[PDB]
Amino acid sequence: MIKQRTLKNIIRATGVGLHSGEKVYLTLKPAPVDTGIVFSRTDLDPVVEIPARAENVGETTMSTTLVKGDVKVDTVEHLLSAMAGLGIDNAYVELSASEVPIMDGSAGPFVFLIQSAGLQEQEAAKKFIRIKREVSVEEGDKRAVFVPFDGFKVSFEIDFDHPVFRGRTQQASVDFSSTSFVKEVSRARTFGFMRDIEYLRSQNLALGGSVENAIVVDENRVLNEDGLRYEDEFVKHKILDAIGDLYLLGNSLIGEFRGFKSGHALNNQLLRTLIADKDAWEVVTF
């Protein structure tokens, strides 16, 4: 059989919240079988625990935000993209504050951190959610869809107007049978156009953001001296985001996803619509 996975050792790291600006301490620990990924606010009395499941998603406005009563955990998508990408079923994630640290804006630092723990194969068969029927959601020109597939394959498309996309498809597919998450996806960074960023900073958001933890773009060009990590880094990051938002199903996926111009909100509507349509999915082991 294929068996469940957790970490071997505790791990710490440090950083700033992309939106919040606050310094935050992160700790990863091992977890028993059938626990899932669980976020814990350790700065509060009592301590607040929130499973990383579609049911706990409070806001979806330019991040994915876990909510429980009056308490937030902000911007969880990149860490979960990482936990998805190394097949981590079980793990506790303690935070000193309300936002996960941005680090370099990619899953790079999380993917290495988890490898630094080591991998514990646990005595329990791994569970997958398999797609049985087509499911899709639309909103204006936007679209997100699950199709059945004996594998795991993600595709995405964006549709921006900018010099930087001149000549380009703004299109990327990745079949994870034949490519590496860590190599071909994990490193793509969070991006932002100046105007979008200034509109956030007027509403008391994007406070930890700069060229150290994100790609910034003016009317002309990428402002980052050292340039891009891939020729298609922007659409690659939308795929990394999608992979984090899907891991809110609580298990790894047997199927195919396709996004067209979609984000945190439409990605989450697709989960709820699939979950609600019982005949389109089933839990399975090997």
Ligand SMILES: Clc1ccc(CCCn2ccnc2)cc1
């Ligand atoms: Cl500097 C800066 C640039 C872009 C954004 C938008 C973040 C959108 N996002 C967040 C996580 N993944 C994508 C914020 C600050």
Ligand SMILES: [Zn+2]
């Ligand atoms: Zn992102």
